[model samples]
Target: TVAYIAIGSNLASPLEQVNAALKALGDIPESHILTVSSFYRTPPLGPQDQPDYLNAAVALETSLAPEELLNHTQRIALQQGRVRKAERWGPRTLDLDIMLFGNEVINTERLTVPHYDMKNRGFMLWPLFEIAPELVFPDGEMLRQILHTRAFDKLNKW
Candidate 1:
């Protein structure tokens, strides 16, 4: 599976956290990091409570199933000092989302593919396009078509 992972961090040395996840991503069983996007800094997505931003994307080839891949992703975040809260949209040491899993549209109780809201998320979309400019969803949508948010204008790419 050619999977895309969304890496986000805003705590515990956000920059280092993202890089740490990237390093661990390469070690996941039956997976290899193919392309990594340039890191982008933006404000918090939900509340103004959190500070700073570090978001990134990676394209990888994985022989593991989606659930198997998700397990590895979550584990890496936990190892990085992340705590599991009932609430989301808050600051964290690391967050790894499986944005795309091949052309497979998975919507199980555990996860959703194409990340559901990625279309309007410029922070991830902008960086996602940077590494995978030719990306096309299973619904015949291109990355460029869904970049309708002006939020990307403020992103600082690193």
Candidate 2:
């Protein structure tokens, strides 16, 4: 399976944990990193009081199913020492999201592919476009559509 993942962090040494999280993802069984995007920082979308986010995008070639991949990502969240879900858009040590799973749409109790809010979040938009310019969502939506909706490269990068 080919999947695109969003990596984000804004606490617990955000930048370093983001990198460490990537390494952990690479170690997932039957998977390897294909490409990675530029990492940058931006303000929170929900709560503006926390530290800015260090966000990136990644492509993974994996043999694991979508649920299995999600499980591994959740494992990595704890692996990075994330605290409990405090509030919407709250700071995190590491946030791993499976953005796309082979261009297949999935809406379940635990997960949502296309990530529910990716297009609206500049952090996700910029890095994702950087890593996969030709992204075609499961519904035939293209990546470049983000251009008309948001600014792609205005982040205060590291």
What are the RMSD figures for all models against the true structure?
2.9, 2.9
The residue-by-residue lDDT of candidate 2 on 1-158, one tens digit each, is 88999998887668788889999999999999999998888776675567777889999999998999999999988757545545434445567999889978888999898799887777887788888888777887788875666665577675
Encode model 1's per-residue lDDT on 21-84: one tens digit a residue.
8999999999999999999987765765776778999998999999999999988877764465
Measured against the true structure, the TM-scores of the candidates, in listed sequence, are 0.86, 0.86
lDDT (CA) per prediction: 0.83, 0.83
Clashing pairs for model 2 are none
Once fitted onto the true fold, the runs of candidate 1 whose alpha carbons sit more than 4 angstroms away are 45-50, 84-90, 148-153
The candidate scoring highest on TM-score is 1
Any idea how many clashes model 2 has? Answer: 0
Q: What is the lDDT of residue 91 in candidate 1?
A: 40
Q: Report residue 31 deviation for candidate 1 (angstroms).
A: 0.4
